Amino acid sequence: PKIHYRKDYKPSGFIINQVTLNINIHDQETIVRSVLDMDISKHNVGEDLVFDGVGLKINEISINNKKLVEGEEYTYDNEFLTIFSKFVPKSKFAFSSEVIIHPETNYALTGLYKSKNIIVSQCAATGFRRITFFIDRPDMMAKYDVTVTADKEKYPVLLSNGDKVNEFEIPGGRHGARFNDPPLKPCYLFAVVAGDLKHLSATYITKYTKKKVELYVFSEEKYVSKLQWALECLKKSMAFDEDYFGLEYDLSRLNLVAVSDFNVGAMENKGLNIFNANSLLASKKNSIDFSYARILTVVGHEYFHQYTGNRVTLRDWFQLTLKEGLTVHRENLFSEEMTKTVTTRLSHVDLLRSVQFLEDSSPLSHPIRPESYVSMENFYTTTVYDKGSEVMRMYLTILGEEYYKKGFDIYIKKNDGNTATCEDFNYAMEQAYKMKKADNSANLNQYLLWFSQSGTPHVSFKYNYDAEKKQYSIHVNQYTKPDENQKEKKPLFIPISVGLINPENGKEMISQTTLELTKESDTFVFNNIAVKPIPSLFRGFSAPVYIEDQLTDEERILLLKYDSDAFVRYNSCTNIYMKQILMNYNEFLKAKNEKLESFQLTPVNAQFIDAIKYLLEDPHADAGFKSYIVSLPQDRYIINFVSNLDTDVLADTKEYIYKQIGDKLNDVYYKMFKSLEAKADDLTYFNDESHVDFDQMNMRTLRNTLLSLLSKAQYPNILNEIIEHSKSPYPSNWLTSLSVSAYFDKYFELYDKTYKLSKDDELLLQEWLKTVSRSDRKDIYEILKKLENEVLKDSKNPNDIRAVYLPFTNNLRRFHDISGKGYKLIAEVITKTDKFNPMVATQLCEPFKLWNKLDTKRQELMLNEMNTMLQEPQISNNLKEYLLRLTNK
Ligand SMILES: [Mg+2]
Ligand SMILES: [Mg+2]
Ligand SMILES: [Mg+2]
Ligand SMILES: [Zn+2]
């Protein structure tokens, strides 16, 4: 297993100037002919010419139109094509090859593969080498001339990068299309699509140069009517990058294509973006509400790659966070602007502090720029993407809007036409930092630690107020736990957006202020503070850290009620919950360990429950925010604060706290569920697929959250509401009616009802699968068996497999069953999946990421299943590397 090291980067001894591709698709094989116009680079030292080439069947290879002989002049081991340097010319030359590949049986969904009735490529690192021979690394820039031929009846629509310069007929009912793409690009931005695609189209006119841009969104014929929202989202994306960043689309056409089989969300190939169907297709009748924000962010994301990707490429894959973190950051700015709901930012923080914090405190912990990798595909992680995005976002927080845009422009201009690194972006931002500080000696050298240092920093506070001096002090401390990546952790540049709330009236006491913590500790003093304030810390979640506010619950309640920052209100609520959770957990644990016949639990803070009631009953308050405050923190957020987590005890803890709050608020919950109906379920624009109301969807989120709370609490006659809810036109609603019906005898009745509603839409059925999979049922294991036998079967569709199993793994009581039954089940699925799709198999390992955080028994059970998976003879390199790092072996 070869390990690639970041510090070992060296430019190739070769150059690939021109790529000329002929891709001939047939019924049971695809023939690929390729001519590479190559040269010797200045870094060449007479080494062998080595191409990446995975799973290629060689018909012939040549240098300068002369066939190479195997064994004497070259060797190929199904992974690397080695051509002995004596047969490699010392000047310009042409390498040519003809290989056979088989997209029909490419179930790994990387390289060229068949998804239902569409042939599509997926090259983003390591993929292009599965189509033909290449020096498959992002610093190898080349020009592309691509011809695609296929059966005209099966594949009338042919797409690739650049301009379609020729279309022609071929004997045998075949046809061809030539695409020439003159600008240099890396091979991971290459793409080809073939199929019976239908489209929606539109024309977009750019802001400044007035260039008309053709916009096409593609899908199979059956779901072509589900393309409208994506088209609108694409329009929004282009406008935003124009309005915010001043950037126009460079080409005359942009294609979006949905395919049913896809490992991730999407890919951003130049002028041709390719999407997981679940992230491009939606309709009001056939999609849950979540799809609309999903399509918005993903379409936006892949579009924001276009301008930067056109000018600035990654030097190497260790720089992945530079393009992914930055693009997710741009995607998030976009989404917040488009949704105009505080829950957009809250949802990204919620994901980071659950999933990414878990990752960063696990043995899989890595910095956003890793020092090494075995399988590049294994580092498309929430750390690289989402912590990466937060690191990118901190630049904006530090610099402010005006100087951030200045820094961004410097980045593009300085690095236009070349490859770049994380250091290049930091340098550009440093120039803006100098300008802002009016100080040419200012620098962001320390900031680089955000790229190199793994682990989540802990930030804690102490306060002092001098009533006579009107003087307020915030003492801050930062600390990152040592891990297997760095022995000694260094202090980071931590930007702390703060406000000061007057507890007497809820007013702001100081202007916008961002504290710059650059040391292990510092004391920030504020003069002319007329009264002892309550600090509002890390507004907007201004740094990706553990926040320890050291406030009382009284102070936290006041922030929750009166603070202006949505995140700090949300965090204060979170902190109140966590204090309660840790307290009741330990009480439950102690009772269990000592086998007590009787014991006490500390009740939920009465004033806290009062505050929740207050917010819930406020008409001017946000429905989405309301849904957060009545929900306990994510289990994966909680587990970061508990050693040897007994999942049963946590389940008991959560149940007690929900019951405590419900005993007081259930009538308020029921009242709101009824009063919210009219606005939440309004059908006025149900058949207008361009009309998306994010506030309204949040009202539905609130209703469905309340309905779940009332169902679990067995509220009197709530089953009546549940049944009527099942009749709603909105899938978010009637799928909710299924999962909340779990506590009733009507479950399998609604099981069958909602299945029939879902079965005729591929994506909708997958949402139904998720709902069933997540259903709080005691017979969930039998139910999963039913799904396998009756619905899933031997599907190799990642959307199908993930939908059936992943939500189940969040079942705190059932997945973590003490017999290890759940661990065994998922391991079997992982091993089964790894046979045809290593990446998705690695995805299905996610439950095990917390293995060393559980109680000793469950650690043992999980560890056994992982070692069992590790012992599989046919285990992939992806899965092997992942499990080896996770098990610290
Ligand atoms: Mg092959
Ligand atoms: Mg969907
Ligand atoms: Mg980019
Ligand atoms: Zn991306």
UniProtKB/Swiss-Prot annotation:
Q: How does it assemble?
A: Heterodimer of the p68 form and the p35 form which are derived from the p120 precursor.
> How is the activity of this protein regulated?
Inhibited by 1,10-phenanthroline, EDTA and bestatin. Inhibited by (Benzyl)Tyr-Ala (BTA). Activity is not affected by phosphoramidin, PMSF, leupeptin, iodoacetamide or pepstatin.
Role, per record: Displays aminopeptidase activity with a broad substrate specificity. Preferentially, cleaves after Leu and Met, but also cleaves after Ala and Arg. Low activity towards Lys, Phe, Tyr, Trp, Gln, Ser and Gly and negligible activity towards Glu, Asp, Pro, Ile, Thr, Val, His and Asn. Has dipeptidase activity. Plays a role in the terminal stages of host hemoglobin digestion by cleaving the N-terminal residue of small hemoglobin-derived oligopeptides.
Any miscellaneous information on file? May have an additional translation initiation. Translation initiation at the first Met codon would generate a form that contains the signal peptide, enters the endomembrane system, and ultimately reaches the food vacuole. Initiation of translation at an internal Met codon would result in a form that lacks the signal peptide, thereby re-directing the protein to the cytosol. A nuclear localization signal would then lead to nuclear import.
Q: Where is this site: Important for substrate specificity?
A: V264
Changing V264P has the effect of: Severely affects substrate specificity. No effect on Zn(2+) binding
Q: What binding details are noted for the cofactor?
A: Binds 1 zinc ion per subunit. Also, can use Mn(2+), Mg(2+) and Co(2+) with less efficiency.
User: Where does it localize?
Assistant: Cytoplasm
Q: Which organism is it from?
A: Plasmodium falciparum (isolate 3D7)
Post-translation: what modifications? The full length protein appears to be cleaved into a 120 kDa precursor. This precursor is then proteolytically cleaved at the N-terminus generating a 96 kDa form which is further processed at the C-terminus into 68 kDa and 35 kDa forms that remain associated.
Residues the record marks as site: Transition state stabilizer = Y385
Positions bound to a peptide: A124, G265, A266, E268
Q: Which residues of this protein are catalytic?
A: E302 (proton acceptor)
Q: What is this protein called?
A: Aminopeptidase N
Write the span of the intact protein that is present: 196 to 1084 of 1085
Q: In which domain of life is the source organism classified?
A: Eukaryota
